[PDB]
Design an enzyme around this catalytic site. Structure first.
Site, PDB file in Angstrom:
ATOM      1  N   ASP A   1       0.757  -0.960  -0.082  1.00 15.95           N
ATOM      2  CA  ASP A   1      -0.242   0.072  -0.255  1.00 15.95           C
ATOM      3  C   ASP A   1       1.124   1.543   0.470  1.00 15.95           C
ATOM      4  O   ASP A   1       2.502   1.074  -0.153  1.00 15.95           O
ATOM      5  CB  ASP A   1      -0.924  -0.273   1.477  1.00 15.95           C
ATOM      6  CG  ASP A   1      -2.343   0.530   0.990  1.00 15.95           C
ATOM      7  OD1 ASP A   1      -3.592  -0.191   1.021  1.00 15.95           O
ATOM      8  OD2 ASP A   1      -2.111   1.404   1.103  1.00 15.95           O
TER       9      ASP A   1
ATOM     10  N   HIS B   1      -3.613   6.088   3.670  1.00 16.43           N
ATOM     11  CA  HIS B   1      -4.134   4.439   3.205  1.00 16.43           C
ATOM     12  C   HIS B   1      -4.037   3.767   3.406  1.00 16.43           C
ATOM     13  O   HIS B   1      -5.229   2.592   4.266  1.00 16.43           O
ATOM     14  CB  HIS B   1      -4.719   4.512   1.749  1.00 16.43           C
ATOM     15  CG  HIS B   1      -5.280   3.990   0.927  1.00 16.43           C
ATOM     16  ND1 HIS B   1      -4.826   2.888   0.968  1.00 16.43           N
ATOM     17  CD2 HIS B   1      -6.238   4.028   0.604  1.00 16.43           C
ATOM     18  CE1 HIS B   1      -5.876   2.214   0.164  1.00 16.43           C
ATOM     19  NE2 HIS B   1      -6.570   2.629   0.322  1.00 16.43           N
TER      20      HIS B   1
ATOM     21  N   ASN C   1     -13.793  -0.527  -6.398  1.00 13.85           N
ATOM     22  CA  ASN C   1     -14.855   0.749  -6.816  1.00 13.85           C
ATOM     23  C   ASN C   1     -16.025   1.178  -7.732  1.00 13.85           C
ATOM     24  O   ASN C   1     -16.197   2.283  -7.529  1.00 13.85           O
ATOM     25  CB  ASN C   1     -14.072   1.962  -5.055  1.00 13.85           C
ATOM     26  CG  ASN C   1     -13.563   0.970  -4.241  1.00 13.85           C
ATOM     27  OD1 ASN C   1     -14.020  -0.039  -3.207  1.00 13.85           O
ATOM     28  ND2 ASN C   1     -12.477   2.241  -4.209  1.00 13.85           N
TER      29      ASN C   1
ATOM     30  N   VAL D   1      -6.644 -15.618  -6.033  1.00 11.78           N
ATOM     31  CA  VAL D   1      -6.071 -14.639  -5.087  1.00 11.78           C
ATOM     32  C   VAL D   1      -7.678 -14.677  -4.409  1.00 11.78           C
ATOM     33  O   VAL D   1      -8.813 -15.191  -4.714  1.00 11.78           O
ATOM     34  CB  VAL D   1      -6.044 -13.485  -5.334  1.00 11.78           C
ATOM     35  CG1 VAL D   1      -4.582 -14.091  -5.522  1.00 11.78           C
ATOM     36  CG2 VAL D   1      -6.782 -12.517  -5.821  1.00 11.78           C
TER      37      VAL D   1
ATOM     38  N   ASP E   1     -14.942 -13.656  -4.400  1.00 12.29           N
ATOM     39  CA  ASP E   1     -14.746 -14.503  -3.102  1.00 12.29           C
ATOM     40  C   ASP E   1     -15.574 -14.357  -1.487  1.00 12.29           C
ATOM     41  O   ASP E   1     -16.199 -15.625  -1.464  1.00 12.29           O
ATOM     42  CB  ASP E   1     -13.678 -15.289  -2.427  1.00 12.29           C
ATOM     43  CG  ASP E   1     -12.133 -15.929  -3.888  1.00 12.29           C
ATOM     44  OD1 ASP E   1     -13.106 -16.796  -4.041  1.00 12.29           O
ATOM     45  OD2 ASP E   1     -11.804 -14.701  -4.027  1.00 12.29           O
TER      46      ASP E   1
ATOM     47  N   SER F   1     -11.419  -1.160  -0.186  1.00 13.35           N
ATOM     48  CA  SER F   1     -10.373  -1.103   0.681  1.00 13.35           C
ATOM     49  C   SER F   1      -9.726  -1.511   1.788  1.00 13.35           C
ATOM     50  O   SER F   1      -9.194  -1.686   2.243  1.00 13.35           O
ATOM     51  CB  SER F   1      -9.325   0.181  -0.018  1.00 13.35           C
ATOM     52  OG  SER F   1      -8.396   0.437  -0.904  1.00 13.35           O
TER      53      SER F   1
END
Ligand SMILES: [Ca+2]
Ligand SMILES: [Ca+2]
Length: 279
Positions: A39, A69, A161, A177, A200, A224
């Protein structure tokens, strides 16, 4: 263990129902696990991290989080008050600049970095990576995420988003993933959350209180914010010995709250991350 007046998302992850405010979890709390937060960095000096966070890599002039963030996401993984896995080890990898942006080539290097760097760390209960980032579809970004997962790291990535199908975004669209959508405190799909067959799991993502830079806190929203709930949950479950890095996403889906969310498009899973903690 019980944390009263917890952020709603923590309470939600340990509840079969919305509308409660206490987080319940096994006191092992992810001890002996490690979570890489890939990040903008982590303000490791924040009192909320208790010496359990450190920066391990940057691709920029500083390893400092000049944005916030990454610090917020790390806080949801593992801060004392705002975190899911309150005793995990947090490792910051700064692939995003202080404006929150990063080149895919840098992001790829950061994923390959974690796959190797875990061999430099003590994580007897296992290793997780939280990727609250992404852009448009890239086979190379997806392949990097697939490699990281294959190497024995539980990779959790934000769905995005865009209120759109996550198939068109990376690393969200990498099947191997754990791709995480966002919900709100009333069990609605977050207004901005991506959706689609590649998701998922959902986690709390609207109005999430966590750490911020300058030793502060704030509430923000995004996939996020959902992602680190799932990453922290994985670390917690791995410490308990209930699952492994390769199997944790599937285990989380297996054990999720089913059918609780509204405005889930046809063809998207209706699964909300849940720790199934029974004192
Ligand atoms: Ca329920
Ligand atoms: Ca998947």
């Amino acid at each position: 263990a019980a944390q009263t007046n917890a952020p709603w998302g923590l309470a939600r992850i340990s509840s079969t129902s919305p509308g409660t405010s206490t987080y319940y979890y096994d006191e092992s709390a992810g001890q002996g696990s490690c979570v890489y937060v890939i990040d903008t960095g982590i303000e490791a000096s924040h009192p909320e991290f208790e010496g359990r966070a450190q920066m391990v890599k940057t691709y920029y002039y500083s390893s400092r989080d000049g944005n916030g963030h990454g610090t917020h996401c790390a806080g949801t993984v593992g801060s004392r008050t705002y975190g899911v896995a309150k005793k995990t080890q947090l490792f910051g990898v700064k692939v995003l600049d202080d404006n929150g942006s990063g080149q895919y080539s840098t992001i790829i290097a950061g994923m390959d970095f974690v796959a190797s760097d875990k061999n430099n760390r003590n994580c007897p209960k296992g290793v997780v990576a939280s990727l609250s980032l992404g852009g448009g579809y890239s086979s190379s970004v997806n392949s990097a995420a697939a490699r990281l997962q294959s190497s024995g790291v539980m990779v959790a990535v934000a769905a995005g988003n865009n209120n759109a199908d996550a198939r068109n975004y990376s690393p969200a669209s990498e099947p191997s993933v754990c791709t995480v959508g966002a919900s709100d405190r009333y069990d609605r799909r977050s207004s901005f959350s991506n959706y689609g067959s590649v998701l998922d799991i959902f986690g709390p993502g609207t109005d999430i209180l966590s750490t911020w830079i300058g030793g502060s806190t704030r509430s923000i929203s995004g996939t996020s914010m959902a992602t680190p709930h799932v990453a922290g949950l994985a670390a917690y479950l791995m410490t308990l010995g209930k699952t492994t890095a390769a199997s944790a996403c599937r285990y989380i889906a297996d054990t999720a709250n089913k059918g609780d969310l509204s405005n889930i498009p046809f063809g998207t899973v209706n699964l909300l991350a849940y720790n199934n903690y029974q004192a």
